[PDB]
């Protein structure tokens, strides 16, 4: 029920802005000053300009390092987000990871969907669910995903907790 | 702290999937069966194919009406989301509204940022905060935003509740 720092970095649907208090809506109250994510009046900073900073809600990082949508943002020089130019990764880009957990197709492009996440998927939210750890010739997950006691890659208490064999293990 | 139906349609950051239980993570537990939003293994349905259905997390609606990112999705025939082709609206498109509350520039394109939301913004999350209601020659908000007792357009208890003069007023 809450967004931002109070909702553990949860985002409002349909780009509703998250007020300074951690609640979702539209208007000056939510989108003006203190806005956390969503359609904030003062676009957030991102990319190079703001330290490698990614945009929330999948917004595009424009060449000037401001968050938004449209040609000025997803167009020429976009630094991140669903850019208009195919985003490269994988073995064919010296292991680069796609941002925001997007899957890296077999061919070295960042995206989401069966074609990217499906078989051959190199990194990101692959849906191939390949086994990691001891029971897997001790192979490690990508993106620093935790390798659960079960020999599964993921993020969550169940994966990263007790008997987490590798990855961003809390335990 | 919760997502989906349990988090009032709140979305996980960095396309983390929302399990059937309303919690955020990555892996089979969250992204497999019951997945609500985010990088679900089974891309959600959208657009024409799924009743005008929009994609969560700002994903692109591919021509086949499946949710995702990359050329197959934001490319040719995209039906919604941050499509690779400029999205039209406004007076210059018989009042069309941009989807997901994006601002409709002065020129009739959908986007987010100062250039779209800034002065001339026609609909969506305009940041111009123009007055609505009684104190405003009785002008109505766009997107069915509520016109708060104060003469402000927005979405939230404060706008849509008590003394909501127009819009998607709960009161
Ligand atoms: C697509 C995109 O990234 N758009 C931005 C724009 C553009 O970056 C801008 O048009 C650059 O050509 O900037 C927006 O914010 C600007 C606004 O705050 C102005 C007001 O002076 O300043 C711009 O930065 C100034 C900065 O404030 C000064 O400290 C600095 O000395 O000069 C800077 C030069 O840009 C901000 O970028 C805008 O509304 O114009 C926001 C868009 O999202
Ligand atoms: C970019 C995009 O929208 N991609 C989809 C694809 C494409 O729509 C597909 O390649 C169409 O050319 O479809 C994906 O799902 C498909 C998969 O479930 C297969 C398995 O048979 O079925 C496709 O729909 C079948 C449907 O199941 C039958 O009921 C129907 O009689 O024929 C349909 C023909 O498409 C699904 O689209 C895929 O993985 O291929 C998902 C991508 O997101």
From Swiss-Prot, chains A, B:
Record's keyword annotation contains Repeat: yes
Disulfide bond residue pairs: 3-18, 12-24, 17-31, 35-40, 46-61, 55-67, 60-74, 78-83, 89-104, 98-110, 103-117, 121-126, 132-147, 141-153, 146-160, 164-169
Keyword line: Chitin-binding, Disulfide bond, Lectin, Pyrrolidone carboxylic acid, Repeat, Signal
Residue intervals of the Chitin-binding type-1 domain: 2-42, 43-85, 86-128, 129-171
Gene Ontology molecular functions: carbohydrate binding; chitin binding
Binding site for substrate: 10-12, 62-73, 114-115
Quaternary structure, from the entry: Homodimer, u-shaped.
Functional summary from the UniProt entry: N-acetyl-D-glucosamine / N-acetyl-D-neuraminic acid binding lectin.
Additional note from the record: The 4 sites proposed for binding to carbohydrates (N-acetyl-D-glucosamine) of receptor molecules are on the surface of the agglutinin molecule.
Protein name per its UniProtKB record: Agglutinin isolectin 2
Source organism phylogeny: Eukaryota, Viridiplantae, Streptophyta, Embryophyta, Tracheophyta
Span covered, complete protein: 29 to 198 of 213
């Amino acid at each position: 029920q809450r967004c931002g720092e109070q909702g553990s970095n949860m985002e409002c649907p349909n780009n509703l802005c998250c007020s300074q208090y951690g609640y979702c809506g539209m208007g000056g109250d939510y989108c003006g000053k203190g806005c956390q994510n969503g359609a904030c009046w003062t676009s957030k900073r991102c990319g190079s300009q703001a330290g490698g900073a990614t945009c929330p809600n999948n917004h595009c990082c424009s060449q000037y390092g401001h968050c938004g949508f449209g040609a000025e943002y997803c167009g020429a020089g976009c630094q991140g987000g669903p850019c208009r130019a195919d985003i490269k990764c994988g073995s064919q880009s010296g292991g680069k990871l796609c941002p925001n957990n997007l899957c890296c197709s077999q061919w070295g492009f960042c995206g989401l969907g069966s074609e990217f996440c499906g078989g051959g998927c190199q990194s990101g939210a692959c849906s191939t669910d390949k086994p990691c750890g001891k029971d897997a010739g001790g192979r490690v997950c990508t993106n620093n995903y935790c390798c659960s006691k079960w020999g599964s890659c993921g993020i969550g208490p169940g994966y990263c907790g007790a008997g987490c064999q590798s990855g961003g293990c809390d335990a």
